[PDB]
Amino acid sequence: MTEYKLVVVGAVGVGKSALTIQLIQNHFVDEYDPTIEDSYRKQVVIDGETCLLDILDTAGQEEYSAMRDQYMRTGEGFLCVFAINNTKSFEDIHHYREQIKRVKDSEDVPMVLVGNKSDLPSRTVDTKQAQDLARSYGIPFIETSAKTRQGVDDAFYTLVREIRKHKE
C-alpha cells in the first residue's frame, strides 16, 4: 500500500486543521489550535485503489524554517492551504513556492492550490485572480469550504492524482 507523503503547508489563521482532520475523522474543528506536529494516516481509495495517506500537519510559524526544509525534502505532495479571507496569504504563495522549489530541487512539483475559507462571506481574493496566478505554478485551484466541507474531497483526489502523474 503506497504511503504518499502529504505535506500540509499554509499561513497562520488559515485553518489547516479544518481541512486535514476534516476528511480523516469527518469533523470540522472550530477551536484555534496552533498545530505543531500532527500525523494523519488513513486508507484512502484513490482511482479505485486503496492507498495509505501519510499526512503531516506542521506549524505555520516562521520559527521553524531549518526543521521545515528537512521534512520538506521528504515530502512528495504539497498541500498549499491558504484562506481567501486574507490577501497577505495569497501574495505569500510565491514566497513559500521558492522554498519548496529549493527543497525539492525542481521547478516542477505535484501540488494543489486550495482556497480555504470559501464558506466565509468575507472573501478578499476572487476565484479568477487565484486561477490566474495558478497557471504559472501549473497546479489546479479548488475552493475548499471548511464549514460546508464542499470541495475538500475533490481537492484531495486531485492532489493524489498529481503526485501519481509526477511519479509515472
Ligand X SMILES: O=C(CN1CCCC1)Nc1cccc(Cl)c1
Task: Provide the binding-site residues for ligand X, judged by CB under 6 A.
Answer: 5-7, 39, 41, 54, 56, 71, 74-75
Q: Closest separation between CB of residue 34 and ligand X, Å? A: 19
Q: Closest separation between CB of residue 112 and ligand X, Å? A: 14
Q: 93-104 and 66-74 are packed helices; what angle lies between their axes, rounded to 10 degrees?
A: 60
Q: Closest separation between CB of residue 30 and ligand X, Å? A: 25
Distance CA 97, CA 67 (A): 17
Q: Which is nearer to ligand X, 76 or 92 (CB)?
A: 76
Buried b (16+ CB within 10 A) or exposed e, 87-109: eebbeebeebbeebeebbeeeeb
Any idea of the CA torsion for 118, 64, 4, 84, to the nearest 10 degrees? 10
Q: Which is nearer to ligand X, 71 or 157 (CB)?
A: 71
Residue 149 grid coordinates: 466541507
Q: Which is nearer to ligand X, 50 or 74 (CB)?
A: 74
Q: Closest separation between CB of residue 127 and ligand X, Å? A: 28
Q: Which is nearer to ligand X, 90 or 156 (CB)?
A: 156
